[PDB]
């Protein structure tokens, strides 16, 4: 049915990415505890996780993996431009869960960038039926839900910033 | 010389389903000539005349991203030669494989098949 | 030692999650969570990702009326004859009819039925013992009154039962192996018996041929499930039990060869390429240094179509190895001393188009072959223990002859090199 | 390759429908071989080789695991002892018979 080789290629590339993840900021158990602080998996915490490593590989979805990648993803883009979405990560998720509205002057934005342009250019041929009864690409944006922060802190932003950051995200897909 | 002398040809025939779920890549040509298939000059090249990767709804956002390089867990098809002749069987409606721009050229070959049965008949 | 037979008691061993209660296997298009086809306990036929085994061991409860042990009762019939007929019913009216009217009394012993039978069973024992001829298999009775009567009916994996649900041209065929046909039989019948909650004799009249069926089911169960599951080639013992598949194998055709010792040989770049793959899908991530998934598409990319840096890894594998890569050749079918060959890769061939496997022309006696087509088979070896071991399979060891103890004849010169020797010679 | 229902090799309809490059279709050992595997005085090492190849599941996935990593020129593989299921399944084929297991 299914074969054993992919899977096991797959686990052990995990497993050397957790070991690259412990080697380049010299973490170990105790501060993986810290940035769990007692935190439980978020879907569309997974979901940003499987993203960011579909070049990569796939998510096993192992939890002391999945809190080991985010550290290290988190950490990642903490090193450059991105800002409030390492801190969206950062949080817990509230019990708010639903989907409020996108400001569609930003997606217009989004569609002009030619960054985008050219990704829809590579998924043309998806994006002359599929998007146009539903975009499955931006659905995220409407799929936005509220986070309790392990600090006392919960998430209040404008939009722009996950529409330019998580734009650069893509491009790094 | 002589080895050179005792050439044999060889014929085969494959068959490939496309359905709603699984669609093809543009395996051959740039992206104006989206072409999954060698047409009938062309020679079919790497040992493969198509692949189909499995979408999924919930997997559009990354599986079936960079739509022009195959992912690794697609279904290919192997063979060797050049494309000699081409027989499409269609059940979908048209409309969709106009507004389908992964089927252009399955379109194009219907249509081409359709205009010789009219003239025939 | 091994696997030792005994009837144990099955109501020490018998729990309580897997006695199945009676259910049609299908339910409104989906299999029922309590018949025979139970995701429950019982696994999922497609899905292998159920924690719980295939092992699992499903169960059925009898204990209103014990009844005797299936395997054990041919052993009853040849202590006692014709127990068949004691325990087949017929002395009834009522339901059964007059019918022959006319049937060998035999003392009153026959026509009483499963549950007299079980009542009287050492009477009826003591009236048919040889102590000439059966006393043996008296005595292994005497050994065995716990398990002559059983009160728990096991049933097999459905995932490891290949019965499944067709859809046939007329409709959705449940296509079963038959073993389950009698096992639904079996759960239908007794069905019949915790449906008849009502007392009356008539009731019983009735009932005790349905504990007759349910004997002669039994019997058939046994008897069906060891016709095949356990007998002949096809059977599970000597299919698999010895000899089974293997996971990293090839075979191919063999070719003559020269310019190397005897025990060097070339395989063709294509079937090394598949069977070391993990050997070289390590070295290519440790020498890229990027995941091993890049490292998995470029290795596609190398068996695809010929390439020259791939090429230069397998050198270099095969240049470093600890033992050389050896492997096992045995040529089908093996019944020769040392139709096994241990052999050492010597050499890679360089062209994509070549399939076929060099070999020098000394073995082809000692391996009984001919370049006229024989398929041969290779088994590569991994561990280094493993190689110490087969070691003594190398030709080398084979040199001497375990018969005389002198120099082989099958490694000794053949026609044509026998041919030129005397040519230089004489 | 695919595994079958038990859990072992088994050929596949890849190949027919052009899916598969090569053939691919295992190698099983039969009676003779085992014989002659057995000439050699290393009945535990053959058991090894069944039990890490094809039989044992576990035994299998730890010699993927060993040998993927690890030195390339040079494998030094670890066996567990976890029972094979070819003798589990054997073990369910004589408990539901009736038959049981009692070592030694």
Redesign the interface.
């Known amino acids: 049915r299914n074969d054993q080789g992919n899977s096991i290629i797959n686990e052990c590339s995990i497993k050397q990415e957790i070991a690259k993840i412990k080697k380049k900021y010299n973490v170990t158990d105790e501060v993986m505890k810290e940035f769990i602080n007692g935190r439980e998996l978020n879907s569309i915490q997974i979901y940003l996780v499987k993203i960011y490593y579909s070049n990569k590989f796939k998510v096993n979805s192992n939890k002391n993996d999945i809190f080991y990648l985010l550290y290290g993803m988190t950490r990642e883009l903490g090193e450059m431009n991105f800002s409030i979405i390492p801190e969206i990560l950062s949080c817990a998720i509230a019990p708010n869960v639903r989907k409020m509205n996108n400001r569609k002057k930003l997606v217009d934005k989004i569609i002009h960038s030619d960054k985008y342009s050219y990704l829809l250019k590579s998924y043309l041929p998806i994006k002359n039926i599929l998007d146009k009864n539903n975009v499955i690409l931006q659905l995220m944006t409407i799929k936005n839900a509220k986070f309790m922060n392990k600090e006392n802190k919960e998430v209040d932003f404008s939009t722009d910033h996950l529409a330019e950051e998580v734009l650069d995200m893509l491009l790094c897909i | 010389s002589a080895a050179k002398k005792l050439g044999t040809f060889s014929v085969n025939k494959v068959k490939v389903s496309v359905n709603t779920n699984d669609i093809l890549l543009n395996l051959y040509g740039d992206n104006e000539n989206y072409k999954g298939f060698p047409d009938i000059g062309e020679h079919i090249k790497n040992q493969i005349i198509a692949s189909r990767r499995r979408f999924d709804y919930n997997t559009a956002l990354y599986e079936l991203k960079n739509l022009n390089e195959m992912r690794d867990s697609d279904t290919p098809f192997f063979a060797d030669g050049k494309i000699v002749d081409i027989e499409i069987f269609s059940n979908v409606p048209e409309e969709e494989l106009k507004v389908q721009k992964y089927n252009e050229q399955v379109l194009y070959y219907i249509n081409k098949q359709k205009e010789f049965s009219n003239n025939v008949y | 030692?091994?696997?030792?037979?005994?009837?144990?008691d099955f109501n020490e061993?018998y729990n309580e999650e897997n006695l199945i209660t009676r259910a049609n296997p299908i339910e409104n298009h989906e299999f029922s969570d309590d018949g025979i086809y139970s995701e429950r306990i019982f696994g999922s036929?497609?899905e292998?990702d159920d924690d719980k085994?295939?092992?699992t061991?499903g169960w059925i409860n009898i204990e209103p009326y014990y009844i005797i042990?299936?395997?054990l009762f041919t052993i009853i019939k040849k202590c006692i004859p014709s127990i068949n007929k004691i325990i087949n019913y017929q002395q009834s009216i009522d339901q059964n009819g007059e019918n022959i009217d006319l049937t060998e009394e035999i003392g009153e012993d026959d026509y009483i039925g499963l549950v007299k039978f079980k009542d009287n069973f050492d009477d009826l024992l003591e009236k048919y013992t040889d102590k000439k001829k059966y006393q043996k298999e008296y005595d292994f009775l005497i050994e065995n009154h716990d398990k002559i009567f059983?009160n728990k009916l096991?049933?097999?994996?459905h995932?490891?039962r290949?019965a499944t649900l067709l859809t046939g041209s007329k409709g959705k065929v449940l296509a079963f192996d038959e073993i389950n046909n009698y096992y639904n039989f079996v759960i239908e019948y007794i069905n019949q018996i915790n449906e008849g909650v009502v007392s009356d004799d008539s009731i019983d009249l009735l009932l005790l041929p349905l504990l007759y069926n349910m004997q002669f089911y039994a019997n058939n169960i046994?008897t069906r499930?060891?016709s095949e599951?356990?007998r002949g080639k096809k059977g599970?013992?000597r299919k698999?039990?010895?000899?089974?598949?293997?996971?990293?194998?090839?075979?191919n055709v063999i070719t003559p060869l020269i310019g190397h010792p005897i025990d060097e040989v070339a395989m063709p770049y294509?079937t090394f390429a598949?069977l070391y793959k993990?050997?070289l899908?390590?070295?290519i991530s440790?020498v890229k240094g990027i995941?091993?998934?890049e490292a998995?598409?470029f290795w596609e990319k190398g068996?695809?179509?010929f390439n020259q840096e791939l090429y230069n890894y397998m050198e270099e594998?095969i240049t470093?190895?600890?033992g050389g890569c050896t492997f096992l050749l045995?040529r089908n079918?093996?019944?020769s001393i040392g139709?096994?060959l241990y052999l050492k890769i010597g050499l890679i061939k360089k062209d994509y188009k070549d399939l076929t496997l060099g070999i020098s022309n000394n073995l082809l006696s000692a391996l009984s072959g001919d370049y006229d087509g024989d398929v041969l088979?290779i088994?590569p070896v991994?561990?280094?223990?493993?190689k110490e071991?087969?070691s003594?399979?190398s030709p080398q060891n084979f040199l001497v002859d375990r018969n005389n103890g002198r120099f082989n004849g099958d490694f000794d010169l053949q026609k044509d090199q026998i041919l030129g020797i005397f040519i230089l010679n004489n | 390759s695919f595994m079958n229902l038990r859990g072992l090799p088994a050929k596949s309809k890849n190949f027919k429908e052009h899916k598969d490059l090569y053939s691919k279709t295992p190698v099983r050992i039969g009676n003779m071989e085992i014989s002659n595997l057995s000439l050699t005085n290393e009945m535990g090492s053959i058991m090894d080789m069944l039990n890490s190849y094809s039989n044992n599941e576990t035994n299998r996935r730890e010699l993927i695991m060993q040998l993927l990593t690890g030195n390339p020129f040079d494998t030094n593989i670890d066996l567990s002892d976890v029972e094979s299921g070819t003798s589990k399944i054997l073990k369910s084929l004589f408990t539901c018979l009736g038959l049981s297991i009692d070592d030694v």
């Open positions: 030692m091994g696997k030792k037979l005994s009837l144990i061993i036929y497609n292998d085994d295939i092992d061991i042990n299936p395997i059983i096991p049933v097999f994996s995932k490891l290949p046994l499930i060891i599951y356990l599970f013992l698999n039990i010895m000899g089974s598949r293997i996971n990293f194998s090839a075979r294509k598949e993990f050997q899908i390590n070295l440790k995941n091993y998934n998995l598409k068996i695809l179509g594998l470093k190895t600890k045995n079918p093996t019944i139709s096994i088979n088994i991994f561990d280094n223990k493993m071991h087969f003594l399979l």
